[model samples]
Target: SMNPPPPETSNPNKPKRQTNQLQYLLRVVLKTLWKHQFAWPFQQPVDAVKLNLPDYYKIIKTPMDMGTIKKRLENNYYWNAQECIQDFNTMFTNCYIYNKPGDDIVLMAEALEKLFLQKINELP
Candidate 1:
């Protein structure tokens, strides 16, 4: 009279199996971000010494970047969409912390963050 648990529930590989779908969406979102002009600053880690922002490292304890997020996504470091999004948020937070309000780079970070939110909301 009652249905048994679905095969997916019984599968030992369920975590990775279920993650594959979200991962695809996440990759697409990431690719879009990477292509944006505003993404330039976030594409790589900040070079405090070269950039002459010696206090940068001291202010932003946890720096993040699109390249690092991409690496984490490829290596299966994010088990869920939330984890991936959190990394993106962290990257933006770092941007806000380091750059003064109204700065071009900070504005770019704001635009990218909005774009990311829109992309994810459109996902299934």
Candidate 2:
């Protein structure tokens, strides 16, 4: 089979800027927020058992998915907000099978539970 021609080269006068993984992740977040008109609810009841309506609305409207977030993390090999949230959720849920004491598992669980409790307390 005949070889394909090489892709065209960019103009030397034009400066090429490379965005790192963190930059890309930030871009995604900003784009999502802008596209979905997302904004944090200032008056959201702190004690709500679940996310407030506006929060849910923003989350549901966004196109963000675990696979895309995972791919971003894999490509960057650096943790982003999504990765941190996933890791924290896994630890809080004890999904890693680390049931042993003094393994920081309880700490994560306690923190998550406390957060929920506080949120619930703030609810109307």
Candidate 3:
């Protein structure tokens, strides 16, 4: 086994992968669009979107507004990135049901379902 040389080892000092909501969600959103073959019109790294948009702080409870989006991203990316965020913005709100709406699991499941169909569609 030693002949194989212990297969390299861990290094805790090494930096870990970095990610956040906008970066992570939007990346998968882009992947989902492509995986489904919708020609969804976007191709950029998640960092292309700000880890924190200028107006994202405004979120108190309700969904964000077009003003916030426009102001924060009026002059960014290919317009496609912002659009993807826009889609997710609504997808991430009013998500409750002990009082209303329902669990966020529904939203996640719905998004996944779309991606699943896309995966199937892309298969020959």
Worst 10 residues of 2 by lDDT: 38-47
lDDT of 2 by residue, 1-124 (tens): 1212321223345433334534544354323322332222211211123523233322222222323333434444333344424432433343223244565545544544455345333323
Pairs that collide in candidate 2 are 46-119, 47-119, 47-120, 47-122, 47-123
Is candidate 1 or 3 superior in TM-score?
Answer: 1
Quote each prediction's TM-score.
Answer: 0.80, 0.22, 0.22
Indicate the TM-score of model 1: 0.80
For residues 1-124, write the lDDT of model 3, one tens digit per residue: 0111111123345433323433433344434543543222112211212543333323322333223333323223223343435433443342221123444545543554466445434432
Note the clash tally of each candidate: 0, 5, 4
Clashing pairs in 1: none
lDDT of each: 0.75, 0.35, 0.34
**RMSD (Cα, Å) of model 2:** 19.2
Ranking by lDDT: 1, 2, 3
Task: Write candidate 1's Cα lDDT for 1-124 as tens digits.
Answer: 1222211112234354337546655567899999998888888778776678878877877677888788767656666778778788889998999888999888899999999889888776
RMSD of each: 12.3, 19.2, 17.5
Give the number of the best model, judged by TM-score.
1
